[PDB]
Structure formats: structure tokens, C-alpha cells
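User: For a reading group we're discussing how well predicted structures match intuition. Take Peroxisome proliferator-activated receptor delta. Before you show the prediction, I'll give you the sequence so everyone sees exactly what went in.
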Amino acid sequence: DLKAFSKHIYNAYLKNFNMTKKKARSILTGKAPFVIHDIETLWQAEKGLVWLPPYKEISVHVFYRCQCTTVETVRELTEFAKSIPSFSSLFLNDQVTLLKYGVHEAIFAMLASIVNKDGLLVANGSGFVTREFLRSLRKPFSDIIEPKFEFAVKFNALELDDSDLALFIAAIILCGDRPGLMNVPRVEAIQDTILRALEFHLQANHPDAQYLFPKLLQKMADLRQLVTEHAQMMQRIKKTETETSLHPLLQEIYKDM
Ligand SMILES: O=C(O)CCCc1cc2cc(Cl)ccc2n1S(=O)(=O)c1ccc2ncsc2c1
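Assistant: Thanks. Here is the predicted 3D structure of Peroxisome proliferator-activated receptor delta, as C-alpha cells, for the group to look at:
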């Protein structure tokens, strides 16, 4: 039962996400990606070695590439959530509420899978952008990604695998205290099952792990603070970077945050 639950979620994870932490760790360790570290190498990656609204500048171009990836991750997470039979039973409007307030939390948790202290993978792992380069972009674009790295570095210390992330992401999305939920008791009931499956799965997959389950519950709270600060950055960019095109889907997500 609780094992069949964890297996069903893990299969939905494998079936809906192109880049798993397993694959990403193969590329990051060397079992190679083109390194994008300055304007010169960025342009070479665009020509064909690695790869949108009209061009504007280098910083905005990086923004557009990150924006497209997150939009794609939003699509995958939507199919992941739907692949959970309990989630699909909720009314479509409640489904939209869970995704609205949950995707960025899941996205940032999965971002740690393709990230180390020096950069992150891009374009199905065929490229690698250095943390230095992102830092050197024009404000405020250089301030967006740095808090994600600091979270990711600490999150990867836990050394979760794809089987853990599937349940961890499922618990992020099925959060009972999202604003505007119609059937709060139903969602909370689904989350409690997922959480019980998570601890159950962690006991078997990480026997020697001390406090791993409560640490993940703290990580979930961290992710909510990370998204709150991320939503503010994006709202400030909407006000001061009027020339930067914001994706309408991400606009709706941030609309009331
Ligand atoms: O509004 C939005 O959320 C879209 C915009 C999101 C976004 C724009 C952006 C621009 C720069 Cl110069 C640095 C980080 C940036 N981020 S991010 O930190 O959130 C990010 C970066 C890479 C990535 N690869 C899979 S996911 C994912 C997420």
C-alpha cells in the first residue's frame, strides 16, 4: 500500500521529468557540458553547441532562457501532479490553486539537482553556466539566482535521490494551507498520506539518516520563504524593467503573492 504509493509517485516522476538528479550527477561528475562563463562562450553556445522574445541585451537574454526552462518545468510538474490519482480527483480549480502556489517551490527544490557550488546545467545538460557569469550580469538579474544556489548547496548535503524527490515534490504541491483552496480537508488528507509515504520511504532508503524526515519538513518551510523573496524580485523587475518580457503564465502565478 504505502510502498505501492511510493512506487506510483516515483514512476510518475520518472515519466514526466526529462532531467533527473541521476542523469545530472552523471554529467556533473564526468562519466562533457560546454561551459558558458562569459559573453564569448554564451554566444558560442547559442550558435549550435547548446541551442524567445526579441533580443534586448545579454542579461535579459539569460533571463529569457531561464524563463523558458521554468515554464517548461511548470508543464512537467502539472503533468506530474495530474498523474497522482488523488490529485486528479480534486476540482480543476483546486488543482490550479495547488500548482499556482506550489510550482516554484518544487522548481527550486529540483533546481538543486542540476546545481553545484560553481554553476548549473542548461539545455538538457549539454551546457553548464558558471555561477561567476550569473553573478556578473546587470542588476537586478544577477540577484535572482544567488539565493537559489545557497539553498541548493545545503539541500544537496542531504544527498537525496530521485525516489526521495518524487515524494518530496508531491508533498510540496499537495499543501493544505494554500490561499483560496475549496476542499482544505481533502488536500490535507492527501498530503498526510504522501508525508507518511515519505518518512516510510526514507526509513528504508536512508537507514543511517539522522533526522532526515524532520529536516525535509524544515526544507519545505525554507522553500516557501525562498519563493516569497523570489516573487518580490519578479514584481520589482515588472516595475523597473518594463522592457523585459514576462511570461503571462508566470505573471498569473505571481499575481496575488
Ligand atoms: O519568473 C520566473 O520564475 C521565471 C524566471 C526564473 C529565473 C530567471 C533568471 C535570470 C537570471 Cl540572470 C538568473 C536566475 C533566474 N531565474 S531562477 O533562479 O528562478 C532559475 C534559473 C535557472 C533554472 N533551470 C531550471 S529551473 C531554473 C530557475
